[PDB]
UniProtKB/Swiss-Prot annotation, chain B:
Belongs to the CpxP/Spy family. The keyword Zinc does not apply. The gene is spy. The chain holds residues 52 to 147 of 161 of the full protein. This is Periplasmic chaperone Spy. Homodimer. An ATP-independent periplasmic chaperone, decreases protein aggregation and helps protein refolding. Binds substrate over a large region of its convex inner surface. Substrate protein folds while it is bound to chaperone. Increasing Spy flexibility increases its substrate affinity and overall chaperone activity (shown for 3 different substrates). Protects proteins in vitro against tannin inactivation; tannins have antimicrobial activity. Overexpression enhances the stability of otherwise unstable periplasmic proteins. The lineage of its organism: Bacteria, Pseudomonadati, Pseudomonadota, Gammaproteobacteria, Enterobacterales. The keyword tRNA processing does not apply. GO terms for molecular function: protein folding chaperone; protein homodimerization activity; unfolded protein binding. It is found in: Periplasm. Has an elongated cradle shape. Residues 84-89 have a biased composition (Basic and acidic residues). It comes from the Bacteria. Induction: Induced by many sorts of periplasmic stress. Produced upon spheroplast formation, not induced by growth in 0.5 M sucrose or 0.35 M NaCl, nor by mutants that have a leaky periplasmic space (at protein level). Induction is partially dependent on the Cpx envelope stress response encoded by cpxA-cpxR; does not depend on sigma factor E (rpoE). Induction is also partially dependent on the Bae envelope stress response encoded by baeS-baeR; cpx and baeS effects are independent. It comes from Escherichia coli (strain K12).
């Protein structure tokens, strides 16, 4: 939550600079779920299918969040970390 | 939408299904984000570790939903399947 940190105008521009759900996966889950048996082998295959895309997405997310973290003041960092701890 | 008109035997059964069917990953993520530099190889390791938990969580979720689907009447399964198309998890 980067909104409730009282971002300065410079920080808002910096975040803009930094920042610049497939139905296939649902249909595969549906085929596993709507069946008269639970096929664990087929489910594990399903779960693993978009491993690479997940990796790319989560690396992008974590890098972006790290970049934004590092434009914060020490006061804002403490708030961001406190918020991080009180969520899950 | 649980607009499926669940039999008390069905609901009893569902609760039973659910009854049957952590922090480390989060703190590691936190420590990657709250770091002076982004460490890609470390982030990749965190992501790979999270794939373990995701597989456990997804298998339990699909198994649970499958068990539910199979306590349903033909008309309720049609409805369950229609609801499925509108949902995202
Ligand atoms: Cl679907
Ligand atoms: Cl944490
Ligand atoms: Zn700039
Ligand atoms: Zn579907
Ligand atoms: Zn199908
Ligand atoms: Zn199979
Ligand atoms: Zn396995
Ligand atoms: Zn793999
Ligand atoms: Zn790769
Ligand atoms: Zn993101
Ligand atoms: Zn996040
Ligand atoms: Zn980058
Ligand atoms: Zn430092
Ligand atoms: Zn495993
Ligand atoms: Zn679940
Ligand atoms: Zn089981
Ligand atoms: Zn679901």
């Amino acid at each position: 939550s980067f909104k409730d940190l009282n971002l300065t105008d410079a920080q808002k521009q910096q975040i803009r600079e930094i920042m610049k759900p497939p139905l296939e996966e649902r249909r595969a889950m549906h085929d596993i779920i709507a069946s008269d048996t639970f096929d664990k082998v087929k489910a594990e295959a399903q779960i693993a299918k978009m491993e690479e895309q997940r990796k790319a997405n989560m690396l992008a997310h974590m890098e972006t969040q790290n970049k934004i973290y590092n434009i914060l003041t020490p006061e804002q960092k403490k708030q961001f970390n406190a918020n991080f701890e009180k969520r899950l």
